[model samples]
Target: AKPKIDKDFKGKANPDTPRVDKDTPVNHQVGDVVEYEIVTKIPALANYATANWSDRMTEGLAFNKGTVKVTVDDVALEAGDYALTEVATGFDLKLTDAGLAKVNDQNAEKTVKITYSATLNDKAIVEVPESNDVTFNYGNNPDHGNTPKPNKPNENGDLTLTKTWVDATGAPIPAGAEATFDLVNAQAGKVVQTVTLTTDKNTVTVNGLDKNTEYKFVERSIKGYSADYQEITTAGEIAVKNWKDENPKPLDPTEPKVVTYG
Candidate 1:
């Protein structure tokens, strides 16, 4: 039976987490619980004997066994109805014969919902994506099964900017000059964060940015200075420069009588 699965960020620390899909990855930190739901339908076929459901998680995640919950339609399944086991890679769940009999007799298709949670661990990769996978197997096809594989579920990225200042002659700018920069979500055209750089502290780091998202830095102009923003590097480094413009000469004065006396 082919199944459908989706995930959501379920940590109490974040109240505004959105539903996770194949294209959208949840930006999670250590200890954040990511909840998943799998919906499978029993095929209307004779001799539907065995059903096995399993999930595999990457090392970056720890499956929360205590939070496992299963239901058939609106009714919850009792503990004896199914067998749940913890495996090295993840968890395995199977419906007992007594449990399969309850749903196999129905002329109409019955829905089986499996819900669980997994916590992002301290070993989670910062730039690379990680995900949990779910599979369903039935007796109708002993060798074949269905896996609606979860996409990149959790990922984090970093953005760093190094600021420097100089004058038109390539000399360092005055020590007191300061400049501010905005970290913008380039796709959304919004500034997500801002950082000011002084001569002493010329570097800023913005951690936990969405890895799949596009970002850019915008410098706030200072009087008598021009700014240059460079493209971001593969290492997530950005270089920004601000240089003071050359001073302009003053206009000649009209009061020249004192020169004639000399």
Candidate 2:
């Protein structure tokens, strides 16, 4: 009787948040230390005696050493537990000589995680991100042992916006309301995105939004609250935004910015 040598794996590209295949690109800024994680499902294979992750990097991104992490079944192993080799374009990561024993001994199902970080210097900035990709090599059989992973989400090089809702007194609103609006480009006079906001729905990530672009929200409708509503801003003009922060209402460079509808 022949032994079972089955192995089929799948991978995910998680850039702090889940950015599966072909999803929205991740955003990064200058000098930002970004973390990229890959999760691959390890199939139950009896003769699986080897494994490695080979990463190819884009220009301007430096692989941060001492930050390579590997986990099996949610258990993190030490740096010595794995072997890493620096490549001209990127790097190679896999289990240590002794650590390979643990992988070959087990035939049960397991989840494997490999996480690493890179710094985005001035050279890293670009309009079209070159991006990165990894490939997994495992087992003795050359026919089907190599698995190519999904590419990292595209880098849109934009900003993230967080919106919140609260009462006028600076306290939490008691079922304030729900609203819908359009993000309009100030100069282009074009609608970029249609946004819906509710008591539960607040934050919306504005992808591909240029830093130099001037935008305003045009309110479509404001409804949901039961109380005798008072008017804040003219309905058709735009949805007026009230900015609040812990450091100062006037806004400080050091303070983290949070948005709340007033």
Candidate 3:
């Protein structure tokens, strides 16, 4: 049987007061586990050119880094609901030596670490998740979609996939540099995808893809002395029919479906 949720408490002492105190008194104390889930969503972008390119490029583009912040409510904290403030930390990634060599021909595979800290108040405190460190390969790979296959299942389709590292002016990225992209799930949680560039002409392609399927793409610039991380870019609901005939029409925009969780 499904659990019943009462809209109104049957035994209420004060009608004006909130009913949560009637049936279930708030039981909070120091060292209590005040658990909660963190949810966040961020849109990422992918850039495509049908005229110059043959297929769709879906890898190694940078995106806005999504962040999650948690704050203890004043009421909960004042009531001694929690012990020593504990904030989640240590979100990072390390690239393999070979992977680093493929992307950053000059710099060795050094671990990238991102840290996050939050401020606190006497009534309430904020807890923030540490930024994640992610790593990826930048050079061409046999498993990459670009590898020439004799009879690839999906071949010669209009869809194309390619990735290029560029500067703020959108020019080709220089060699021996690195960039990061955000990978977001339906729940709005995010993971970082870092790619180091080893060559100038390095790009990947995806040939055969369903025309009506939805895809999310993101482009980002390397973080350092250069421009700050690029804005989160997105291209959604692209249809094959839009580019089917000899002369293709401009891609139409479609609203992405909203995802909800309890």
Find the candidate with the highest TM-score and give its number.
1
Q: Which order, best to worst by lDDT?
A: 1, 2, 3
Question: lDDT (CA) for every model shown?
Answer: 0.54, 0.44, 0.21
The list of candidate 3 runs beyond 4 A from truth reads: 1-198, 225-256, 259-262
lDDT per residue for candidate 2 within 115-216, as digits (tens), equals 777776564435534345454545432111111111111245232333444443344543345656566543333578787666576554456566444444
> Which stretch of 10 consecutive residues in model 1 shows the poorest summed lDDT?
253-262
lDDT of 3 at 209: 39
* N/CA/C clash count, model 1: 0
Q: Write down the worst ten-residue block by lDDT for model 3.
A: 142-151
Candidate 1: stretches off by over 4 Å: 1-21, 141-262
**Candidate RMSDs in order:** 26.2, 20.7, 22.1
Worst 10 residues of 2 by lDDT: 248-257
**How would you encode candidate 3's per-residue C-alpha lDDT over 73-151 as one tens digit per residue?**
1111121211121223211122233322322322222221122222211222122111111112111221111101011
lDDT of 2: 0.44
TM-score per model over all chains? 0.47, 0.44, 0.21
lDDT by residue for model 1 (1-262), tens: 3323333333211112323333334466777767766666665543454466756554567778777788887589988889887754456678887777766767666777777777777656565445554445454322112222111212457767777777755577554376777776533335788988776788878887776654556565465554444433354677766555422111111100000010
